[PDB]
Write a protein that binds this ligand. Structure first.
Ligand SMILES: Nc1ncnc2c1ncn2[C@@H]1O[C@H](COP(=O)(O)OP(=O)(O)OP(O)(O)=S)[C@@H](O)[C@H]1O
Lengths: 72, 288, 197, 72, 72, 72, 72
């Protein structure tokens, strides 16, 4: 899904992702008994990644963390 | 011999057409047949344009085709095919434009900057087209034309507004059965005609107040235009060659989060705009 | 302009006994569904009045279950529920937002009856009640907020459990507001009546 | 005299209109036909394809007689 | 015979509306060329007056486009 | 009636209460469709003829129960 | 002779719709008619069938006199 949704929203995949957050994503951010809202939350990953990497870049090659899940 | 033959044919049908109709249907036949060429046309539109001229040249002084086909020719020419303004893909220009547009709920603006931060990235033709429609939900009277037009001037396209307060048929999302006069396209086509390009921006307002209880279902017909590979293939019952409509930015004001259809409750991001605060509106009026 | 078509301010609108400020989000605009319930000795049969549907009646009984858990808060005897037949009018008796977002407002109308004492106006409430008498987080928080402040209402009631959505709210909106946050149905219903019993 | 001249000139403008309507409309029903025989259709299927080929040869620029047959 | 006697009968209706028929679209015919100059000097009404000047010139009882140009 | 007469003569203009409520089409209002037979003047243009200037005062009478035969 | 008389006039007018006039749906109603006159029905059936054959032979555009009659 992260290769899928990150490749489908214009981005090459220049920024990356961990999994200690994605367990917190599926536990705290989509309480559906399916996977579609996980795809939506990964959409918003792509969105906020494109913004905070495009409105001014604190780093050029980053990776999203479980410590900044609320931040993202 | 052959080029003089075809030249004589064209000039003689033009001449005897002008001599017997109402100056070619109130100058309007030759007006549209030279307004065909000043607009850039796709080739199917040239073929259809000749057909519209044919349904008009069979009678420009007799059957309603003298008027409906004349208006059909007007629709083809008035809607500028193969015509696009040099838009500007930009982000902080838009940030300062939504700064000069007044205060705003301002949550919306980061959804906007969010969307357009995706719209700078490179997969595909311009950017790869997997995105919600970013539906405005809320009341009337809040700045669903203000920030809409502010985004329009921020990215430099042709703003317009098309309310959809209770369209009963596909026949006002398409045309009516264009064999009789009185058949007219939808107001969506009226807007797309009225803007001088192929590829403007838009507000879509009042979709939750729609009503559909007949064979022609406009909810399907507005699936036929909201979906991106479809408006470039969408065609009225009035028109016969689909318009290049697919490169569009598109916000949408609904007013109910519920009565909007579930096959249009996909592909959407709930921009909750309620009313403003007192202070927001006071300064809105007070300096704009 | 002309004659003022409304009041000068919704800061004072004569706080009545049984008026419950309905912070729904209607299609066209954001309204105050100021619904009413009046208390009377009766038979216990909850009167399904004012175009009630399926979830509204059980929301009313959800209210009375919590009230039956908490009779002392609202001036209520132990066996009052078997001798009250409460009537209600719901403008848009069919739900506009298709949800009991005015569920605690319906509860407020019931208890504002059952106190026979003023539920204060001018401070408008929204949220869903629970069988355990708790305020469940409400989808679409800011719409209810600024529907209230669109009507000029300063003080808005919203779930405690949506303190999470509170920080995402814009920092030019709450400065004209105050959003007292409730996690159960008791404290919302206790604040919006000054004489709760 | 007025009605006969109106009708005769109406006659030539209709006739050379049919000329021009046949001249400008081409290579679409042939697109239908080369789409017929590119598809491995059985005999009943092919003779109904011929049935709606014969449902063509009518007025087609905005007329319901054969345009729905063309889309068909 | 019913159809063509109807056609020739209304043709004599047109002819008696034309020779001995003073009350027709020919009644206002003199007022037209009398008042083309009282149309305004702005282009909006002047252009439409001049384009109806020639479209009107046909017969005001039987010709279709001449009656709309006549009334307009 | 006398109301609007006093309006236009108070504004030194020509009042013309015109029949627009109960017109079968846009035919006494927007005029009947052109290039062929079946047309009558618009009552707005009746009043615009009936005033002599670029600046009148024109009634639109009894617009409460409007209906029209044009699809529009 | 009378029934065959009305029938001879029937296939004559069905033929008239058969060369031209939308080719009668490529003799669409004729199949119903020949199936009426082939399969041996009761006579109340045959009378309402013949009067619906008379009720047929009309416009074919979502109308009650031809399409639901074809179903019928
Ligand atoms: N928040 C605002 N700040 C500044 N100007 C505004 C704002 N809202 C509206 N305007 C201006 O007022 C115009 C329309 O005002 P509105 O009352 O918002 O009407 P409207 O927005 O078209 O109704 P809706 O909400 O779109 S259905 C806009 O085109 C702006 O020029």
């Amino acid at each position: 899904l992260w290769p899928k949704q990150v490749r489908e929203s214009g981005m090459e995949g220049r920024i990356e992702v961990t999994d200690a957050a994605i367990l917190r994503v599926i536990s705290e951010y989509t309480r559906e008994a399916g996977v579609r809202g996980l795809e939506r939350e990964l959409g918003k990953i792509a969105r906020k990644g494109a913004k905070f990497w495009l409105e001014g870049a604190w780093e050029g090659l980053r990776t999203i963390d479980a410590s900044d899940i609320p931040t993202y | 011999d052959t080029n003089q033959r075809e030249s004589y044919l064209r000039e003689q049908m033009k001449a005897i057409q002008k001599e017997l109709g109402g100056e070619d249907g109130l100058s309007d036949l030759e007006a549209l047949r030279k307004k065909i060429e000043e607009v850039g046309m796709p080739e199917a539109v040239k073929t259809k344009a000749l057909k519209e001229l044919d349904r008009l040249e069979r009678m420009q002084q007799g059957s309603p085709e003298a008027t409906v086909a004349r208006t059909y020719l007007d629709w083809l020419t008035e809607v500028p095919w193969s015509k696009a303004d040099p838009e500007v893909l930009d982000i902080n220009h838009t940030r300062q434009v939504l700064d000069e547009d007044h205060y705003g709920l301002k949550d919306v603006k980061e959804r906007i900057l969010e969307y357009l931060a995706v719209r700078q990235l490179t997969q595909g033709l311009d950017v790869r087209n997997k995105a919600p429609i970013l539906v405005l939900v809320g009341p009337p009277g809040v700045g669903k034309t203000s920030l809409g037009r502010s985004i329009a001037r921020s990215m430099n396209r042709k703003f317009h507004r098309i309310s959809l307060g209770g369209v009963r048929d596909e026949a006002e999302i398409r045309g009516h059965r264009r064999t009789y006069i009185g058949a007219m396209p939808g107001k969506l086509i009226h807007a797309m005609k009225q803007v001088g390009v192929i590829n403007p921006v838009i507000l879509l307002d009042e979709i939750d107040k729609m009503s559909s209880d007949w064979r022609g279902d406009p909810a399907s017909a507005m699936l036929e235009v909201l979906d991106p590979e479809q408006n470039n293939t969408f065609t009225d019952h009035y028109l016969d060659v689909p318009y290049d409509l697919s490169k569009v930015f598109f916000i949408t004001t609904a007013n109910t989060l519920q009565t909007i259809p579930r096959p249009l409750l996909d592909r959407m991001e709930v921009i909750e705009i309620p009313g403003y605060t007192n202070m927001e509106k006071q300064a809105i009026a007070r300096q704009y | 302009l002309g004659i003022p078509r409304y009041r000068p301010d919704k800061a004072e609108t004569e706080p009545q006994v049984g008026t419950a400020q309905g912070l729904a989000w209607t299609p066209v605009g954001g309204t105050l569904l100021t619904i009413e319930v009046a208390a009377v000795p009766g038979s216990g049969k909850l009167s399904l009045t004012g175009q009630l549907g399926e979830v509204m009646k059980e929301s009313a009984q959800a209210a009375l279950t919590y009230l039956r858990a908490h009779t002392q808060d609202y001036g209520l005897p132990e066996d009052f529920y078997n001798k009250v037949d409460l009537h209600v009018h719901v403008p848009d008796g069919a739900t506009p937002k298709d949800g009991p977002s005015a569920g605690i407002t319906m509860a407020t109308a019931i208890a504002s009856a059952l106190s026979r004492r003023p539920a204060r106006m001018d401070i408008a409430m929204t949220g869903e009640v629970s069988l355990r008498g708790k305020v469940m987080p409400i989808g679409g928080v800011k719409e209810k907020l600024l529907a209230a402040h669109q009507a000029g209402i300063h003080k808005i009631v919203l779930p405690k459990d949506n303190e999470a959505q509170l920080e995402e709210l814009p920092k030019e909106v709450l400065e004209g507001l105050e959003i007292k946050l409730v996690e159960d149905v008791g404290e919302v219903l206790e604040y919006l009546l000054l004489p709760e019993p």
